[PDB]
Design a protein around this ligand. Structure first.
Ligand SMILES: Cc1cc2nc3c(=O)[nH]c(=O)nc-3n(C[C@H](O)[C@H](O)[C@H](O)COP(=O)(O)OP(=O)(O)OC[C@H]3O[C@@H](n4cnc5c(N)ncnc54)[C@H](O)[C@@H]3O)c2cc1C
Ligand SMILES: Cc1cc2nc3c(=O)[nH]c(=O)nc-3n(C[C@H](O)[C@H](O)[C@H](O)COP(=O)(O)OP(=O)(O)OC[C@H]3O[C@@H](n4cnc5c(N)ncnc54)[C@H](O)[C@@H]3O)c2cc1C
Lengths: 472, 472
C-alpha cells in the first residue's frame, strides 16, 4: 500500500505491542517483520517469543519438575520408581507453545487491524520505508511515523566462534535433542545461569566461565552472595574472573583454554554455549541519509521518550539504551504509540523489575544496597528468610530471603530484593508499593493473607523498622 | 507471679501475635494456653498452627505433587514408572512441620520476654485471670489489660455426630494414616473443599454434600461458577442443596441419609467429614460477673477496636465478629497491642483477602460483582484468562482467570478476584493497589515483568477499560 500513520519495523515485544497499541488508538498501522520461523513461514514475536523468554522458561519448568521428582519427592512420601526425561519430547512441548503463541499474536494483529508486511524493512530519508519483500519484490511505504524495533543479536567472541552444533548460542542451547554430558557456558549472566540450570538439572556437568570477579553485579550483594552459594550447590561450577583464550573443536568436543588467577587451564566440553552478551541490530536498517544517529556502541540514539534525532521516528527495545528486557521494550512500545496518538505517556525507568528464572528465582526492583551506600544514602534494611515461612515450609521450598531497603530518613521503600519462591510476584508487590510511594511501615500495616509466601514481603518491611513478628 | 500489663488468653494467631507485639511495645506480658499438643507438652500456635492453616496446606502440597507426577508429567517428557504415595510418611512430614513451628513460636516468645503460663485462664471480675494450672494448681494474676483470644471450634451436628474415626472433623481428616476409598464431606466451603481435594487427589472417591443451592456464595459469581466446574472435573462430586437427615455407622462405614431436590438418597462412605462450620469458644472463660458480654451467637461483643464492654478488656479473632481467618486474628492482635501501648492503630476490615488453597487456588479481596450490582454500583470489569499467559503456558498451568472490577464512574479498583496459579500473590498485589487507591489505569500503567503470572493482573486491569494488549 502507500501511506500509513505508523510503520513498525520488528515484531518483537517492543514492536508488536507498539503496533497493537497504535492500532487500538486508531492509527492505520503496518508492521514489517522478516524472521522466517520454524515451520517455514514468518513468525511474529521476535526473540522473546521465538528464542527467548517463552522457550527458555518452558525448559526451566520441565527440567525443574524432573529435578523435583528425582530429589524432593520422597520427603512427601512419593516414590516414583525410576523417573526419566525424554529431552526430544521436552523440547517438542516447547516448540509447540512457541508455535501456538506465534499464531496468537498474528490473530491479535488481525483482530486489531494491523497490516502485516513480510520482508526486510529499511528506513530511507523522509520516512519512507522500503520493504524488500521476501521474494525480491521491493516496495516503498510512506509513513507519517516510523517505529524502529530491530532488536538485538548474540555477541560473537573470537576465541569461541560458533562452530556447528558444538559451539552454539542462546538459540542452539535451546535446541539440544540430548543432554550434553559435560557443558560449558561463557558468561555467568541471566542467560548463562538459566541455560546452565536447564542442562545441569537433567544430568549435564556444567562449568560456567565468567570473566569478572563479581557474580551478578547488578543484583544486590546479599542476593548475589546467596545466589552463588545456592547455584554452585545446585551443580553449576561457576568460575569467576576466568578469561577464555582459545577453543579447539576436535572429535565432537571443544577445549577451551582460559586464564583465571592460577593461570591457564584448559577444560574440554561436549558443548559450549557462548552467552557473553547481545548487541543491537542496526544492519540494513537505516539508509545513509535517514537522519537517524547511532551512539558509539551501536544503539540508535534516543532521548527519554524514544524520539530519535528525526521527528516522527522513534526507536524502542534492545536497539536503544536501557535494560535489555522484554517488558522494557513493550512498555516503550506503548509509550511511543500513546505519544504518537497525543497522550503524554511517560515511562518510569526506575521501576523496571529484573527476574532470573533459576530455582530459587532471583528478582528485584529499585536500588541495590551498595548503590545506595555509594550514593551516601543511609538506609534501614529488613530481611526475612523463607525458612520462617509457614507457607514455604508446607511447600518444602525454604531457600532464599526477602530484603527491603528503606531510606533511614524518610521511611520510603527504595528497593525490594528477593531470592526464593515466587520472587517475581513478591517484587511485583513491592513495585506496586513503590509506584505509589510505600514506606516500610505502609507495607507493614497491611493485611497479608496467611499462610502465603507474600507474608515474607510483609515481615521484612516490618523488620526494616525492628518489629517483625516472626523473628526479632 | 501477680501483676502484668497484658495477660493474653489463648496462643493462636491472634493471641501469640498480640502477646509478641505487646512485649515488643514494652509491656510486661503473659499469655496463657492450655492446648496439650501432639507430644504431651502444651503447644503454642492454636488452631491455625496445630490443626488448621499449616497442616491442611502441607497435605494439599504433598497430594498435589503426587497428582502432578501421575497426571501432568508426561507432557514434559517425564515418565516416572509407577509413582506411589505412603500416606503415613506424608502425614509424618506434616507432623514434623507443625512440631517445628510450635517450637518456633515458643522461642519467639522467650526471645521477646513473654511469660508463658500453661493452663486454663478465666477472666474474673476486676481483670484478674485465674490460671487453673495444669496440675490442679490455681493462681490469680492481676492484669492491667486482658486480651481474650479463645478461638473457635467445629460445629457439631446431630445427624452426623463424631463417631470414632468414622465420622470425624477437620482434625481427624488431617490425621488419616490411609486413603479412604470413598469419602463424604458435609460442607462445601473452604475446609470442605480443601480436605476433599487432599484425599481425592490420592484416590478417594469424594462426595461433598452441601445444604445450600449456591456454591461459594461469598466468592464472586464468575469465580464460583468457574471454581465449581473445575473442582467437579477434578473429581469432587459436589451436591448442592442436599440436607443430611441421618448417619448410621455400621461395619466401619457410615450411611448418610439426605434429601436434595429429588428427595431422599442414602450414600455409604468409609469416612465422613463434618465440615459444616466453626463456633466461638467461650466455655469457662468468663466468670459470671466479669462484665464481658456475648451477642446472640456466642461471640464476645466488641466494637471496631476489639474493646469489650469492660474497659481494659479486648477480644480478638474467631470469638469476635469478622471473618474467621488467621490473618484477621493476627492483625486484630496487633491493633489491640498497639492501642494498649498508646498508638491509634486502626484495622482495615475492607481489605482482608480470602484464599482457598485448592489447585487452582481461589482468592479475592474487595467487593464481589453481585454485591456491587445489588448495591447499585455501575462497574466496569476486566477479565484475562491464564490461557493467554505465556508464563502460564510455560508452566503448563492455564486454568483460571483474573477479574478486576472497577467503579465505572471513578476508575477505582473495587475488587480483584482470581482463580488460577498464584491467586494469593496476585490478589495481594491488588490489595496493595487498593490500599493506595489504584484505578484500573494505574495498574495498567505500571511495568509488570515479562513473562510472569503477575501479568494477568496487569492485563485484566487494562481490559477493565478496553486496552488489553493480549486479548481485545
Ligand atoms: C535465551 C533468552 C531468554 C530471554 N528471556 C527473557 C526473559 O525471560 N525476560 C525478559 O524480559 N527478557 C528476556 N530475554 C531478552 C528478550 O527477548 C529481549 O529483551 C526482547 O525480546 C527484545 O525485544 P525487541 O522487540 O527489542 O527485540 P527482538 O525480540 O529482538 O525482536 C526484533 C524483531 O525485529 C525483526 N527485524 C529486525 N530488523 C528487521 C528489519 N529491518 N525489518 C524487518 N524485520 C526486522 C527481527 O526479526 C525480530 O523478530 C531473553 C533473551 C534470550 C536470548
Ligand atoms: C482445617 C483448618 C484450616 C484452616 N486454615 C486456615 C488458613 O489456611 N488460613 C486462614 O487464615 N485460616 C485458616 N483456618 C482458620 C484459622 O485456624 C483460624 O481463623 C485462626 O486460627 C483463629 O485464630 P485465633 O487465635 O482466634 O484462634 P485459635 O487458633 O482457635 O486459637 C485459640 C487458642 O486459645 C486457647 N484457649 C481457649 N480458651 C483458653 C482458655 N480459656 N485458657 C487458655 N487457653 C485457651 C486454645 O487452646 C487455642 O490454642 C483454618 C481452620 C481449620 C480448622
Amino acid at each position: 500500500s502507500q501511506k500509513f500513520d505508523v510503520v513498525v519495523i520488528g515484531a518483537g515485544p517492543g514492536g508488536y505491542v507498539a503496533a497493537i497499541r497504535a492500532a487500538q488508538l486508531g492509527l492505520k498501522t503496518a508492521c514489517i517483520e522478516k524472521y522466517i520461523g520454524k515451520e517455514g513461514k514468518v513468525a511474529l514475536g521476535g526473540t522473546c517469543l521465538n528464542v527467548g523468554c517463552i522457550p527458555s522458561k518452558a525448559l526451566l519448568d520441565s527440567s525443574y519438575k524432573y529435578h523435583e521428582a528425582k530429589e524432593a519427592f520422597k520427603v512427601h512420601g512419593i516414590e516414583a520408581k525410576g523417573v526419566t526425561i525424554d529431552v526430544p519430547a521436552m523440547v517438542a512441548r516447547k516448540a509447540n507453545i512457541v508455535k501456538n503463541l506465534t499464531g496468537g499474536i498474528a490473530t491479535l494483529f488481525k483482530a486489531n487491524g494491523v497490516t502485516s508486511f513480510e520482508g526486510h524493512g529499511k528506513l530511507l530519508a523522509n520516512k519512507q520505508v522500503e520493504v524488500t519483500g521476501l521474494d525480491g519484490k521491493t516496495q516503498v511505504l510512506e509513513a507519517e511515523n516510523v517505529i524502529i524495533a530491530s532488536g538485538s543479536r548474540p555477541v560473537e567472541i573470537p576465541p569461541a566462534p560458533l562452530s556447528d552444533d558444538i559451539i552454539v548460542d542462546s538459540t542452539g542451547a535451546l535446541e539440544f535433542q540430548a543432554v550434553p554430558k559435560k557443558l560449558g557456558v561463557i558468561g555467568a549472566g541471566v542467560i548463562g545461569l538459566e541455560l546452565g540450570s536447564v542442562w545441569a538439572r537433567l544430568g549435564a556437568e556444567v562449568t560456567v566461565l565468567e570473566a569478572l570477579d563479581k557474580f551478578l553485579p547488578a543484583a544486590d550483594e546479599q542476593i548475589a552472595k546467596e545466589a552463588l552459594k545456592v547455584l554452585t550447590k545446585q551443580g553449576l561450577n561457576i568460575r569467576l574472573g576466568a578469561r577464555v583464550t582459545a577453543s579447539e573443536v576436535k572429535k565432537k568436543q571443544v577445549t577451551v583454554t582460559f586464564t583465571d588467577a592460577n593461570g591457564e587451564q584448559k577444560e574440554t566440553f561436549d558443548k559450549l554455549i557462548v552467552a557473553v552478551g547481545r548487541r543491537p541490530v542496526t544492519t540494513d536498517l537505516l539508509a545513509a541519509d535517514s537522519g537517524v544517529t547511532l551512539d558509539e556502541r551501536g544503539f540508535i540514539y534516543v532521548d527519554d521518550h524514544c524520539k530519535t534525532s528525526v521527528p516522527g521516528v522513534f526507536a524502542i527495545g534492545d536497539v536503544v539504551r536501557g535494560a535489555m528486557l522484554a517488558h522494557k521494550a513493550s512498555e516503550e512500545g506503548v509509550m511511543v504509540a500513546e505519544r504518537i496518538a497525543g497522550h503524554k505517556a511517560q515511562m518510569n525507568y526506575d521501576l523496571i523489575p529484573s527476574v532470573i528464572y533459576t530455582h530459587p528465582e532471583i528478582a528485584w526492583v529499585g536500588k541495590t544496597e551498595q548503590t545506595l551506600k555509594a550514593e551516601g544514602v543511609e538506609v534501614n534494611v529488613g530481611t526475612f528468610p523463607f525458612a520462617a515461612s509457614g507457607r514455604a515450609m508446607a511447600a518444602n521450598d525454604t531457600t532464599g530471603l526477602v530484603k527491603v531497603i528503606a531510606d533511614a530518613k524518610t521511611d520510603r521503600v527504595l528497593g525490594v530484593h528477593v531470592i526464593g519462591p515466587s520472587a517475581a510476584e513478591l517484587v511485583q508487590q513491592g513495585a506496586i508499593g513503590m509506584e505509589f510511594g510505600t514506606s516500610a511501615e505502609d507495607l507493614g500495616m497491611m493485611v497479608f493473607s496467611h499462610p502465603t509466601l507474600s507474608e515474607a514481603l510483609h515481615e521484612a518491611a516490618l523488620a526494616v523498622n525492628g518489629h517483625a513478628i516472626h523473628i526479632a
